Design an enzyme around this catalytic site. Structure first.
Site, PDB file in Angstrom:
ATOM      1  N   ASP A   1      57.178  30.662  53.694  1.00 22.90           N
ATOM      2  CA  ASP A   1      57.294  32.099  53.419  1.00 22.90           C
ATOM      3  C   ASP A   1      57.840  32.960  54.561  1.00 22.90           C
ATOM      4  OD1 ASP A   1      53.717  32.962  53.957  1.00 22.90           O
ATOM      5  OD2 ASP A   1      55.259  32.207  55.307  1.00 22.90           O
TER       6      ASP A   1
ATOM      7  N   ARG B   1      59.307  38.081  56.220  1.00 24.37           N
ATOM      8  CA  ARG B   1      58.276  37.505  55.381  1.00 24.37           C
ATOM      9  C   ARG B   1      58.852  37.714  53.979  1.00 24.37           C
ATOM     10  NH1 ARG B   1      55.269  35.940  51.848  1.00 24.37           N
ATOM     11  NH2 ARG B   1      52.991  36.231  51.836  1.00 24.37           N
TER      12      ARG B   1
ATOM     13  N   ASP C   1      53.304  33.926  47.710  1.00 24.14           N
ATOM     14  CA  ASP C   1      52.349  33.289  48.580  1.00 24.14           C
ATOM     15  C   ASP C   1      52.599  31.792  48.508  1.00 24.14           C
ATOM     16  OD1 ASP C   1      51.233  35.701  49.264  1.00 24.14           O
ATOM     17  OD2 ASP C   1      49.458  35.465  47.978  1.00 24.14           O
ATOM     18  N   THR C   2      52.954  31.196  49.641  1.00 23.19           N
ATOM     19  CA  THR C   2      53.214  29.767  49.727  1.00 23.19           C
ATOM     20  C   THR C   2      52.079  29.051  50.453  1.00 23.19           C
ATOM     21  OG1 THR C   2      54.282  29.952  51.890  1.00 23.19           O
ATOM     22  CG2 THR C   2      55.660  30.194  49.944  1.00 23.19           C
TER      23      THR C   2
ATOM     24  N   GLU D   1      50.154  27.247  53.111  1.00 21.82           N
ATOM     25  CA  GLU D   1      50.503  27.268  54.518  1.00 21.82           C
ATOM     26  C   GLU D   1      50.410  25.991  55.332  1.00 21.82           C
ATOM     27  OE1 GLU D   1      49.079  31.870  54.989  1.00 21.82           O
ATOM     28  OE2 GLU D   1      49.960  30.925  56.767  1.00 21.82           O
TER      29      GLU D   1
ATOM     30  N   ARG E   1      57.059  42.119  60.790  1.00 23.75           N
ATOM     31  CA  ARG E   1      57.948  41.232  60.033  1.00 23.75           C
ATOM     32  C   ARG E   1      58.662  41.994  58.921  1.00 23.75           C
ATOM     33  NH1 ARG E   1      53.792  36.522  58.358  1.00 23.75           N
ATOM     34  NH2 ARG E   1      52.825  38.436  57.545  1.00 23.75           N
TER      35      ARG E   1
END
Length: 136
Positions: A16, A30, A35-36, A38, A82
């Site tokens: 991400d 970002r 939502d990936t 982690e 970010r």
């Protein structure tokens, strides 16, 4: 309307997050709305599929001829500095590709940064129906 802007890949970091050279300066981006799992989670580290999602994003931006960034309507940087944007590799949106393969879930959305929520919701449902990776 939103508009795409050029950028140059510097380094992919997570599924991400990618570092880019935008307007002459290096910046961490970002990926908006997703939502990936982690690899470097602030409390858990490597989760299931994290390596897969990281390899997928890395593969996609690294093999591209042209990278473009598309900021949404609200804030353009999060609290850690970010950039918040939709990233496209040769015309294809990395954010959506990730969700379509079941390599990411659509995140908690907050207006006015929700332009492609519908689109992303549609790909996530398809991936659920196909029982792909995260949805298996």
């Amino acid at each position: 309307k939103l508009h795409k802007e050029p950028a140059t890949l510097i380094k992919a970091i997570d599924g991400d997050t990618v570092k880019l050279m935008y307007k002459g300066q290096p910046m961490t981006f970002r990926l908006l709305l997703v939502d990936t799992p982690e690899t470097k989670h602030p409390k858990k580290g490597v989760e299931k599929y994290g390596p897969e999602a990281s390899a997928f994003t890395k593969k996609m931006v690294e093999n591209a001829k042209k990278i473009e960034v598309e900021f949404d309507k609200g804030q353009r940087t999060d609290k850690y500095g970010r950039g918040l944007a939709y990233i496209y590799a040769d015309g294809k949106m990395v954010n959506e590709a990730l969700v379509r393969q079941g390599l990411a879930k659509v995140a908690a959305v907050y207006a006015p940064n929700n332009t492609h929520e519908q689109h992303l919701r549609k790909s996530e449902a398809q991936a659920k129906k196909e029982k792909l990776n995260i949805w298996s």
